Amino acid sequence: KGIVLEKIAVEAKQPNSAMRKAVRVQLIKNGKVVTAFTPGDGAINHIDEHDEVIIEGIGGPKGGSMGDIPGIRYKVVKVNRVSLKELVKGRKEKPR
Amino acid sequence: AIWQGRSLKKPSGGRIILARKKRKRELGREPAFTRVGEEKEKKKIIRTYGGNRKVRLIEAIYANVFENGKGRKVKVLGVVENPANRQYVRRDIITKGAIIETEAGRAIVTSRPGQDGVVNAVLIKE
Amino acid sequence: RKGAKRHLKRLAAPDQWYISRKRYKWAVRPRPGPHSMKTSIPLLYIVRDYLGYAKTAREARKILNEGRILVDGRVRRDYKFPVGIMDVVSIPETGEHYRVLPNRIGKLVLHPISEKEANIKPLRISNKRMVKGAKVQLNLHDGSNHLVTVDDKDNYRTAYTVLMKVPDREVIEILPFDVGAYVFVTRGKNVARKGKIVEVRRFPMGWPDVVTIEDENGELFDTLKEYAFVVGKEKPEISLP
Amino acid sequence: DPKRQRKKYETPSHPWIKERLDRERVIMRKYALKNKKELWRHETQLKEFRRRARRLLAARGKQAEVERVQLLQRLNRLGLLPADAVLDDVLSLTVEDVLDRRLQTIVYKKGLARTPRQARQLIVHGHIEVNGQIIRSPGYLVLKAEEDTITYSKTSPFARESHPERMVIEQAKQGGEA
Amino acid sequence: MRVAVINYDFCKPDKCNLECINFCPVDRSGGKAIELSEIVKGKPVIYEETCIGCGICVKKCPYEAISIVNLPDELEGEVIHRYKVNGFKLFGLPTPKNNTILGVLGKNGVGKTTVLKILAGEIIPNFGDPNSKVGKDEVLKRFRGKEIYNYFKELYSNELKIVHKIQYVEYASKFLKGTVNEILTKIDERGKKDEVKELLNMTNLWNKDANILSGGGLQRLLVAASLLREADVYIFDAPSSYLDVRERMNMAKAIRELLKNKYVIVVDHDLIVLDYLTDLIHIIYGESSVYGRVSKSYAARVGINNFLKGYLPAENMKIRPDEIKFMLKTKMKWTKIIKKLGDFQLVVDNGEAKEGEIIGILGPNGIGKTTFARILVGEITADEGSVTPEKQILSYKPQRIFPNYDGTVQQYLENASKDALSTSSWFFEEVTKRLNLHRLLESNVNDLSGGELQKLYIAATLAKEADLYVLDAPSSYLDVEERYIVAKAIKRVTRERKAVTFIIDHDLSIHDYIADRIIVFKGEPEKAGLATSPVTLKTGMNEFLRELEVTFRRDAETGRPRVNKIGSYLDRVQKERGDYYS
RNA sequence: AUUCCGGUUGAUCCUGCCGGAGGCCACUGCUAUGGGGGUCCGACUAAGCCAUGCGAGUCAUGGGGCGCCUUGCGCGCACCGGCGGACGGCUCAGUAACACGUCGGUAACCUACCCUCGGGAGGGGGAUAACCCCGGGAAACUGGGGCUAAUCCCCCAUAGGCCUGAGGUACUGGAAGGUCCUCAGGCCGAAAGGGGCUCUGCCCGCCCGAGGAUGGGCCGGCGGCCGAUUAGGUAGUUGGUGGGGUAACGGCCCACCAAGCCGAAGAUCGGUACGGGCCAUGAGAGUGGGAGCCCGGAGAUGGACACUGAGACACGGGUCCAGGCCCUACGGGGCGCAGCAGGCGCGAAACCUCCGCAAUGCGGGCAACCGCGACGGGGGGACCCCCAGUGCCGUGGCAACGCCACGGCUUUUCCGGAGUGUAAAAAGCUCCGGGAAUAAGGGCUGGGCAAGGCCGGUGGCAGCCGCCGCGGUAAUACCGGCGGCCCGAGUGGUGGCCGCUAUUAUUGGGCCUAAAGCGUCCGUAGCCGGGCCCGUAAGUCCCUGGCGAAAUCCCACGGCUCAACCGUGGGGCUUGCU
RNA sequence: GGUCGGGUCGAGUCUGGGCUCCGUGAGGGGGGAGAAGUCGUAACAAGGUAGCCGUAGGGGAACCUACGGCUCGAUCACCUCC
């Protein structure tokens, strides 16, 4: 679980061209900042600052980065106790 | 000295770290210093593991002395020649291997007055 | 930790009880008594499970306190009382007697018998002290003790067996441990096996002595002398299996 | 570090083999199975028989002879082998033989159901007896001695010969491969 | 809603590197939730409106100075009852505890009476919709899984013979006739009438008739009725109202001596008798007229000190920003009235009432004060003696409080006055706001709490501009912060209008707070009421307490008063020194 | 199923790593009809803090009393006295150790309750609760005086116990510092002939001794992690003589003598960790884990110390320090849930402040019986597993694997009811009634990899992407509709372990050019070692005795409808040791 | 039981010396991606001075020079083994 500090975007490696959205997130158990990628299409708009967010691994080979996102190891899964997949597909609107 | 358990050192020399607290059953007691008294032979009674009984002598007078199967109660005078400790002949303290000056002469102890509460001794032939 | 055990879990129970280990959590912890835990079972299990005169321990305790079950001619009212090998469990109201003996599987069973044999109990002697009064105390495998005199102290030896008339405790028929003696094994691999003794080996230090035994079909097997129980001179004479 | 009840069915090593999929699709339609789980359950039954047979081929006496005898008499009792059978025949057996020893299938046979799917419904709604006992588990493997005692329940409308569905089922008296 | 709190004793902004502000997400994202301040010794302050909890500061502070607390909320729960779609809601009920006596302390407007009716079967919860008209069944089915299920199962299967003393003593008074002796012999089923008499001191009133009874005499009667009735559950809603200190002590004694194997639940605002009389006390917290949540058991003294401090240390709730305080601090004369109402002679021994000074009235439960106020308002005329100047603009507020009007609060205050609601008025911004009636303007009156109603009647009575205000039992049905607020309101209005006030009450805290003079009534209760000239505060208090032989100790650092056990070292000292109520 | 597939090139073959594909564990998204069985559910972070209630009491046949029954018989109440509370229950901090496992030992020790045998119960005396008078203190708690009993307490003697000395050699043992006999000198030193009945006998009981049993203590052999960027360590340390102490051996401790002990086959130090039975995985070899059930151990905020008792250095007893909290009349007093429930807090991460002693057992009791948050019973929960459901039949039609219509059936599940079930209830089971109603998703859809040459939108943006890679105006690769595939009451995501991996290789890998032969030689330990004969029989092999708990694993057979589950029996397992 | 002491297991409390551990954190260092950039053109073809190792010195930078070695060096001229 983490607190969203800021919303940012990341450029895909070399051949791909896109700005992958993400958030800098402060984790509570240790107070540490990690960056997490927000899957979906309007996910970064469904997410806001100071929001509590749940942080999974992004997959990726050695528990690491995935695809054209160079240096992001984590996924967002829940936003203020609501799944981002449902927020993105419209259902289950956000509490706050 | 109280605790008579294991030592905190391996024969190698290494340290032991006690995995448990000390149990009541692996303790000891303050020793009897069976000295010579003037009179009024002094003893205490110890309740021990099992509710058993020990008689701990603190001041001895008489020292049953033995020769070849014949005994007599012969009034300790003093202590000489304790191989256990020289401070013991100074303090006039009795133990099992001690020599005691008595009526009827010198006698080597054979009892453990801290345990059995009596002094039994054997005449030395000279 | 701080002291003794007052409980027993039915899985941690002896392997020789016929107990149904997973049905409940607890089992009767036997009292100290005549025999050992390895050669005994409690009277509750005998009254409730083996004979089936009760489905419940309250009924069984009522029975035992009424006094309907004897063990070697004596009323036993405690449900934790140990009942052991070669013990006679009598129910007079029903006219039944049973000998607690072991099975070949190694478990304890009740072999039915009649009154005549039911007034008999064979006792392996198992030790011999000299007690004050210069008397001889035979220390028997049911934890029992019999006093004899320095006249027949030599007729009495350790591994021998004594037939005993139990509600009175009068020795009859000493049976010695010798070659040709009929024997009944009580523990081990060759448990409920019987035959005549053939050989004894000694094994210097505290290693137990061993006996070689010949069965009825001529086979020939070894076990421990302490597990070899004498029942007869040439015939078991106590109706074993 | 305790027991932990384990599944009695094995899933395939790869989920998307075309050969296995086709074969299993055919079996599932023929025998009217709800679940690959059910099929794999019977496959696993067979596999365990086979593994025992293998071990006992490559085994030695006084035990592994007992288990040989036990395996063969179990399979005889289940109706998978004849009494004059051998471990070679175990290794010849098939999941189809197992599924043929299901109750659903024997009720599609014994002219009792007209369709394996209707056999399933009869079993589950409580219209089949095996040795006087209602069984509602269509996966119940029938013993070769219980097979001839299969019948409609006494408390079943299908036991009334005037019943419409009974009349249809006996309009089509058929059996054989099921 | 969880936020952070600093201890400020462990905080050392010098030897810290300020890890809190530095490792705060909000400060990092630009906002402000923690920040330094010279309001304290250069130490940090936390703004609850922005802190989101999350504890980073907690586990970064080396000197574990920061903690997370809980603020209450009208969001999360399993709402038990809603009176109206936007009126009021309740989260949780306390379980009634087979043999112990349960207290229910709370504040005014939070759900005490509501809890009690739910537990008494008077009303059904209706968890969500005030509508849906479904009771007994679905309620049980919904409470399935709990122990209160068993309670309600028996209650609705009428396997327990519950009684219920109610909060409105006059609404009860209306429904009985006769006099006390035959009332009691008719209602009794346990044969303890003598014991009850000897406890509650009901010998004198043992033959008086119910209709002519004083407030506390009537209270004693109802309480006795309840006690004598046989039941399994025994509910008492504010059994300390209209009583004097000794009588409420006797009442507590009666309850806990005569009910010792029964479920007993007690709502009362008097911390003294709750300390006594309670084994356990649940606390009810929330926002008056909005929501109420119940707490845990919280044994009496702990529950009280927690209710006073705010914090409850089992829910980790800060239920109030601050603590209870326990603060510290001619125009008409008459002749010595004699009066006689059949019996109960009364003599008053005249005074002067200079300017706008407040005059308290103290005395036992059964002599005058109400007769006296009735005389002043003119409802009764004296056998002798009269006031001068008579014929002066007047107001009044008796102890006959019960819900009668069918309109709303805005109408009540309107027909009372314009200053009652004109925000133009200092009167408004002092009284009606500090009393929080702006949150009840659109609430009908016949559905109100005792304390909201009391506040309303007081508001009306003080809005009617006059020259002689008379308020009897104004502090009844009220909690302690409201007692003191109401007192300040009275003092303010009275010193603004430079008028007279005659407060009758049994709350020496009030009298000490405001009363710049008082009048003591002495004599045999119900036979003779012998008042006196107005006396200064401490003297009249000391005399009122020398009578009844009661003594009080006030904490110094707070001021909490507590009665001293009879015969105690401090009782003896305070008596032989004459410093009753220090 | 002893398996492969995709990815380095313009193409090829390799090496090699990444990924897929399988199972299990934990969290988690969407979704959810039922039953049964089970060793599941605040273990992973906080052995952090705790509101409330409960978790150990029983005996009226030990004793004197207080009360109620008009009294009798009898009932109740506490108190003294006994017994128990040292078990059970929880947790895994600490601990790399004889802690654990296993084989053995104790001739070096303790053991209340229990069994057997053999004996004994003699003579005196005293106090004090309860009760009565008065209280004190905020409480917690507690004082003074009077009165009384006992299976309470004390004394005396007799038995008995311990020590020493002498000698006899009756007992057992493999072996006598042991037992026993006789004699000496000493020290310690019992007991309730109580209570009850059908009373002249019986029952339950008291003390001593001998043994046993039960439960422990202590010793030893073997056995089981990591690190050398930890190489010397140890000073009562190794041993001895003499003692003390202990239940008991012992440097356990002491005095005095000596210089030993451990170590490169790795000591010491550091790190991590409760140990095992077992569990997961895998063709196996093996790798990994060691919360839940059993066995053992340890601990009860941290640390230290004692009393009482057979047994505690005592989770629901005591004392102090540290630390924290609570009540207070500020004088003082009390608490530490790693018991059941329940909370705070922590966290990604786990239930009801329920019912009952009816079963199983424990304690007490002569007994009946009483109590027990142990245990049992329920409930909550996508814990695991087993069995099922979401309709079936005909005809007719269709864009025919399936759907639609028309008719018929059934009712497992849903609704209602009755019996049984249950400690009571619920569930389940049998029966009645009603009615196809009441009940399917999740993921994927370019290749790996089963499944779309379909359509609409976006247009290097948005987005997907485990890897390869798609997307810059015709996109089967994003979003959506239609369709289809996989599994299906579940399906996906994240992390971890095994497998894949012959990428740790004993089986079974490689070192010219791909990672890799010390620059070369010499040699210590270690390992490998020519041929014949003789011997031994240590390894090795065979056979046999005793052990390696139960559960768990395999198999058959039986009982719950089958199954899961349970029982009977056979086998195996424990590294083995002997 | 107190009060004096005399012995003991003794936690703790003050302190000074070391030894690490943790939470931070100025200021220097290099490393890895990326972005297009800046100076040059070191290397691969004899890469336009053949390349590389070792040592040493020097240089904006790739790099250069020296001594010894290697071919993982091309071409043409010799003898030889094939």
Ligand SMILES: Nc1ncnc2c1ncn2[C@@H]1O[C@H](COP(=O)(O)OP(=O)(O)NP(=O)(O)O)[C@@H](O)[C@H]1O
């Ligand atoms: N029948 C009712 N209908 C609507 N609202 C009500 C009703 N009864 C009470 N309320 C409101 O609910 C709030 C709390 O209910 P209530 O339980 O009566 O307060 P309380 O706890 O008893 N306070 P008090 O009596 O003053 O000590 C009050 O503010 C009422 O206005």
Ligand SMILES: Nc1ncnc2c1ncn2[C@@H]1O[C@H](COP(=O)(O)OP(=O)(O)NP(=O)(O)O)[C@@H](O)[C@H]1O
């Ligand atoms: N109409 C009446 N007739 C006769 N006696 C009355 C009447 N009204 C009141 N009393 C009695 O007068 C005495 C005092 O009356 P009252 O003043 O109302 O009580 P109070 O002193 O105020 N006690 P309280 O109201 O409880 O604080 C009581 O004994 C009444 O019974």
Ligand code: SF4
């Ligand atoms: S709370 Fe901690 S971090 Fe904040 S000022 Fe105090 S000591 Fe510093």
Ligand code: SF4
């Ligand atoms: S809890 Fe978090 S957000 Fe709130 S004040 Fe503390 S650091 Fe800031």
Ligand SMILES: [Mg+2]
């Ligand atoms: Mg109210």
Ligand SMILES: [Mg+2]
């Ligand atoms: Mg009045």
Ligand SMILES: [Mg+2]
């Ligand atoms: Mg490929």
Ligand SMILES: [Mg+2]
């Ligand atoms: Mg925890």
Ligand SMILES: [Mg+2]
């Ligand atoms: Mg656990």
Ligand SMILES: [Mg+2]
């Ligand atoms: Mg004596």
Ligand SMILES: [Mg+2]
């Ligand atoms: Mg640990």
Ligand SMILES: [Mg+2]
């Ligand atoms: Mg704790």
Ligand SMILES: [Mg+2]
């Ligand atoms: Mg969970």
Ligand SMILES: [Mg+2]
């Ligand atoms: Mg794809």
Ligand SMILES: [Mg+2]
């Ligand atoms: Mg590798």
Ligand SMILES: [Mg+2]
């Ligand atoms: Mg290789």
